[PDB]
Symmetry: D2
């Protein structure tokens, strides 16, 4: 445990919590993050040129062996991570044949392809983390089917639910965001190589080959769109922003739960900090830095769209990027909230107490009057509203409101009495009966939530299966490319 773990900040920070403090100093520049993908593009482009007869196997093998050498130099020399200095280092290593690797190619389609491969890997990384986020949310829900508590609207107690019911709302939010990310992946995972500067080339390239060797699923067909297309960058920034906004809302929800006044939940010690001056603080540092990441995600979205609004439909060096440190912040926040949800400690007795005492059961009292004594809904509302006004005025908790108070309210509001028993009123005000009566689809009754959990468990299986399939497709292509490179270098070494 480091020096911030003093007083009530007991134990060490959870590693998910620690990520929130580390990502910024640890993030790569976009140039350094994309550089390893430029190397892969060089090999796939050279292999494709070799299959097309633009390069001989001897030329190809000289280039490919040199790529490995310059790749090793650039591991410690950042100046070799942009195209032309890299090419010049390659030319100093293997000679003038290094220049031939740029046949039919530009920096424009090379940079668009490399950025796509970077965002592609970061997209699967994101999808993996959001799946783990949803897993923690669903698995937590399954343990709280009977954890009765109030739900809020406008930050006011509304009606009784369960913690499991609340968490499945988050699960449905995450399922739709996973669809957004998967829909985006289909547009990110297209290869623009072969567009060259913006208009293709007279060299007889095989664009499908280059695309396949790099794991892309299809082509960015039109060559202008290949170098000028940037909407997938804006879309990636947007889904990041809207997903994180839902994460901010849950962090904010848990933060209010764990205020000194609510006290219906408490953060795990490993996800809280304290003050150096106020020893009583158990601070939601994990929650607030997670929200901060969500707020910061607005930045790339606006910058990218602003740059697109400011140019023509051309290749342009003025377009704003989605940078590694932005995605790194998202992953840190997602992991932190995963651990926050997993380790959250609800005060079940305080939750039930608020539900039973603070008048969220009044809707069921109103519905009972309408459904049992058959008064108009507005008139039942006016009676129960008077009940609450009086109960508050006299200090009577909701689970102490009885037949007398209801009748005086009726008489006070309608002149007439009311035709109900004390048992009917008691069952209307029982908060657990409130939950059980709400047994429709998507409602908090345990059997309803359990059905939602069964559906989410099945959908999570599809989520992991999609991620596994997309990951293996990239791994298989990366292996085919590596095999092709060895075949060319070894064959030239031994038989040519």
């Amino acid at each position: 445990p480091d020096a911030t773990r003093i007083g009530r900040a007991t134990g060490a920070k959870a590693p998910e919590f620690q990520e929130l403090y580390d990502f910024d100093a640890a993030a790569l520049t976009l140039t350094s993050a994309v550089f390893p993908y430029d190397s892969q593009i060089h090999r796939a482009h050279v292999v494709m040129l070799t299959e097309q007869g633009i390069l001989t196997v001897e030329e190809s093998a000289t280039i490919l062996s040199g790529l490995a050498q310059v790749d090793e130099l650039a591991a410690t020399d950042g100046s070799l991570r942009t195209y032309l200095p890299y090419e010049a280092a390659l030319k100093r290593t293997i000679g003038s044949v290094a220049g031939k690797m740029h046949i039919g190619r530009s920096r424009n389609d090379l940079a668009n392809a490399g950025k796509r491969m970077f965002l592609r890997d970061q997209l699967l990384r994101t999808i993996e983390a959001v799946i783990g986020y949803r897993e923690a949310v669903v698995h937590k829900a399954a343990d709280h089917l009977d954890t009765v508590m109030v739900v809020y609207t406008q930050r006011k107690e509304a009606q009784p639910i369960t913690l499991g019911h609340y968490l499945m709302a988050i699960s449905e939010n995450l399922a739709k965001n996973l669809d957004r990310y998967r829909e985006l992946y289909a547009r990110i995972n297209l290869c623009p190589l072969g567009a060259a500067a913006t208009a293709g080339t007279g060299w007889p390239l095989n664009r499908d080959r280059t695309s396949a060797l790099l794991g892309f699923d299809g082509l960015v067909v039109n060559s202008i769109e290949g170098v000028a297309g940037w909407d997938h960058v804006a879309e990636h920034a947007f889904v990041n922003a809207v997903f994180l906004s839902g994460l901010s809302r849950l962090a904010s929800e848990i933060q209010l739960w764990s205020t000194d006044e609510y006290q219906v939940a408490e953060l795990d010690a490993s996800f809280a900090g304290t003050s150096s001056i106020m020893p009583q603080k158990k601070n939601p540092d994990s929650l607030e830095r997670s929200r901060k990441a969500a707020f910061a995600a607005m930045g790339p979205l606006v910058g990218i769209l602003t740059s697109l609004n400011a140019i023509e439909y051309q290749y342009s060096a003025a377009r704003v990027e989605l940078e590694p440190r932005s995605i790194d912040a998202l992953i840190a926040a997602t992991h932190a909230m995963t651990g926050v949800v997993r380790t959250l400690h609800p005060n079940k007795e305080r939750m039930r107490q608020y539900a039973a005492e603070n008048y969220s059961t009044m809707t069921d009292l109103t519905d009972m009057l309408v459904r049992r004594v058959g008064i108009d809904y507005r008139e039942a509302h006016e009676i129960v509203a008077h009940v609450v006004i009086t109960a508050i005025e006299k200090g009577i908790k909701a689970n102490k409101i009885g037949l007398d108070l209801v009748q005086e309210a009726a008489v006070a509001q309608t002149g007439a009495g009311i035709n109900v028993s004390a048992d009917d009123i008691k069952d209307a005000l029982d908060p657990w009966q409130n939950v059980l009566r709400r047994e429709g689809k998507g409602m908090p009754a345990p059997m309803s939530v359990k059905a939602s959990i069964d559906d989410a468990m099945a959908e999570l299986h599809k989520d992991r299966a999609w991620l596994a399939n997309a990951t293996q497709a990239l791994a298989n292509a990366k292996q085919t490319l590596a095999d092709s490179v060895q075949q060319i270098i070894q064959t030239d070494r031994k038989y040519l």
Copy 2:
């Protein structure tokens, strides 16, 4: 023609152009736009309550007849277009039974459903307009397979293409945006009714029935998500923003084409204005107001996401909306650019002249040296760069560069001569040969572009078919609801 049609502003404004001036004063408030959908929800909810036995057929028919009456009052009384004043007008019309239409319902899920139905209709309206935009772009492309012109990168002449090739880049951009809109529609077209305040209800509703009567394809299952879910609003705002950013880039592209210095295109008179003080102006008012709409679309996107980042995962009156005047601006801009593209007049001779004279053919000269005399690509680049530096210095247009100038550049740069003929150089510098040599996938050669046009023509057929299917589904549901309402009112009038 109005009073702005003076001097070079001849004829009347195209009606698509005129839309850009009218939408703001003509736009409805969100309340007035959503109100007709609240009326439909009332009927569908009441019908569902009747099928469930919560309302008798007599109660149902009294309510339904009263809804038509209050609907007629609210046509001229805006104060009756929010829920509770509407309900009070209904209660003054048919009596206290009006209160029963709110059984098992809240304003929270009513407003979420109504806003969805509004955005749903506006989404099909948007998809229709974007289809018409893509239609004008593809059909224009088919008439310019041989309209040779330069493409630009970084606002500098790059290589020769055709106008048809350029327009098919826009078509590919629009196809992906149509996917974004259709993906969004699947999330917008879910029914949150039955969530009531946030936690469902003990009343035995049939949520699938209410959803079907209103044309929704599925449910927003979880009841918290039903009233708290707002990501589809942010997503709708985003796709609007990213689509319009592509529209801004094309408007900007056409604006540079039609500058007094480029002069490669001229706006149709019906899409241009003029100055009251400078009589020589033919101003791109249509283009700049279209870009203005794209810039303004950033606003709702940021406001909506900011409001989501600022709350808990609850129903909240603090969430920012996507308003009718924002969508109205998008439609006006899309229609205007549809007409701009349809009626655009390119100066084909000036386009060819720039391609032939301003050195965009230098890549093919460089590729010819590498591919024919077999020099290293960097060395060919240095020779052709010297050719251009000299040609500019001496005032020699690209289509006048001959064998001499190329050899002196070679000698000046390599000491050695060069092993090419004047015919090889002439064919390298022929701009139409530049286009023909680029015959790969997505490249400007007429046969390549024609293939892209064939594909887009087929995809446009799928686009219109999707829109027709989604539209008819809503029309059929609206008719079923209307039939159900008449059955209840007429049966009660005659047989009960």
Copy 3:
């Protein structure tokens, strides 16, 4: 009271509250808002032309009388509120001499001047409302110098303060925002007339005269800057956004205070609503619609800056505007929060109770150990942190922590005892003594806050004086212009 005033929504909405519901349907378009200022510019320009000898007094009087006539037509004919249709209506009224009012002028500098005059009036309107906001905040503070309560950091109870101390934080925030608005006014209140299209004119205008007649304090000198300058629009949008963000933070603060769990404040009935289904709701509709206005203000700021980033330094029809409905939303939110602050009802007993019982007094216990028994600050912190951990574990409220609990914590943490009396501990934990001990500058002790109130009362006097001076300058100029117009029309009628 309208139909939303049911149940606990007693009485009628405060008119400041009602503004939040009315501004959107009542807002003018920018064109209709700026039109009356275009009329004033016409008169000031014509008068200036008359002084310069460009117009005769007879020509001037014919034009001026015609301006009044067309002004009356345009009161009901919106088509006459853009320049050229207005001019054509003027020409149909008085003849071809109407064309002479545009000598040396363009629509470009006319629109820039008119928008400035609109924003100028709306800026004084804003400054007036923010002054009233600060007045309500300071005057409320003066009545709560002894209203002890906790302040929060990270939504956790921190240390004891007073409500008056909290409100003076808001006052200091508002004082700096008033400086932002006044600094902006100096840049808004410059006249760009005389720039004509963008490059001035050969006509011998007197720009100082036109500026003075319209109440401007100086010129936008350079003629390009006159028509192309737009930063004051972006700046106006920004100050709106940052001011409202502070208003959102106070609304959010009051919303947490008035949660069912805090219960340290209650909104006045005239600033709260209720639910149609949940009769127990007293909802912070005023607070959440005020925050919504703050979130929406992000929109114009981004749209305006995006449009500026997208063009050249020219006049351009693509620039995004600050529209009346945006400023209207700000004024409604400012008025609402003015009334919210004025009528807010704090529960003083609950406030004191939290301060005394929920451990915000622990800092003073820690400071007492360091200052009295002379232990290292970290060691005192570790002892008091143990006190809190134990007190929470045993259910002991802070104002029940005594000598025993402190000594056992010392022994548990240092092995040694502690050299303090029960009276020292009791005074360290007295929350009102916590407040009194913090008597430095800007601290919550009543004498400190009272000094801050004395300073703010004096500054508010300067605020109102600045507003009065700027307002009277505009009123005097508007009268001089009106007198000049009558002099020209009457003199021509009677003596020429």
Copy 4:
């Protein structure tokens, strides 16, 4: 010259150009940028505690000597750059007395003060760079009083001006932005130390002393505002964004000037790049990366304001920061555009040619008809518009339009002839006479622009004087603090 300097990319990149490529990899984290200011705060706080008698001179000297030691450790150990790990390293060095440096202090007011000192230094750095930007713009203008060229509106040639006239528009823009930065500095340069956690302290601090030792000009008085105030961060982000938007507009303007079609300006070789595939490219890489920086500046502004809209008026770890790499991007872009403006090469002959031939002189022809033959302004406009329509139709350049063409247009449009000479028409169409006739305030006539240059030269002197004064105030305080530290350490070493 590096490996990107090939072909037409001759010589080495200007160092201002090179900054655009280096700042991102070279930028510090906010933590590492603020750390040296935390060290200064420690010393100033300890000195203040010593003057107040809270620390003895021996305690003070032990702490101060230890601060230098830990400062040296943290130069290579980034883990020691947050408060509590730093304090723990101090405690391991000098013992438990290290804990006393936090008396009456929190991390909350320490971080607010340190961030202010960072932004304060970066603000003077920004003001210095913007002054150098304005210097290059004014000094360039002084050399082009007679460089006749057209000005554009809506990207169309408008009227003749001079390059000097255009640049003075930029100067007036920069003067107002310098006012924004100086107004901000007054709010940034306030000391929040003494606020402690949020509510001050019972320790008898002297806040004015701490403020003075750190160079602040005043206090953030209220203690809540001291830790919760964040508007100066948002304001700093905004002025950055609006200033850069003006820089983007000039970069965009110069980019269009230097298109292959305009050809009225050419970037200096040291500020241009080229393509690896297209040898004819001279690319505006400096301009587009400068615009990219302007677009990216939208990000921090939105993120900061979003975070403020999302919290209460408290200290909060969720607030978004203005980070060093954002300010670094601004400085790189400002320096680059400074060098771009200084070294820009206008083609004066092409500029004059466009002015003389492409009809920007038509306003003066129209004004001449009104002022000389006394026709109505609309009728003159219709005649000159017909002149242009015919001149374009027949290929007649503006400086070849003579008496015949004007008369036929008159006859074609009014039936009547026109009463002007060929000499009157020739002088109306002389572009240099157009400039000379516009001799009012802020107009392009050389004598007018020269007056504007005289005013700017005087204002630039005030700008540098303000910067010098604010800089020396900080330098003097930093020296007083250093002297105080030596006095305490040396006195304790030798006499105590």
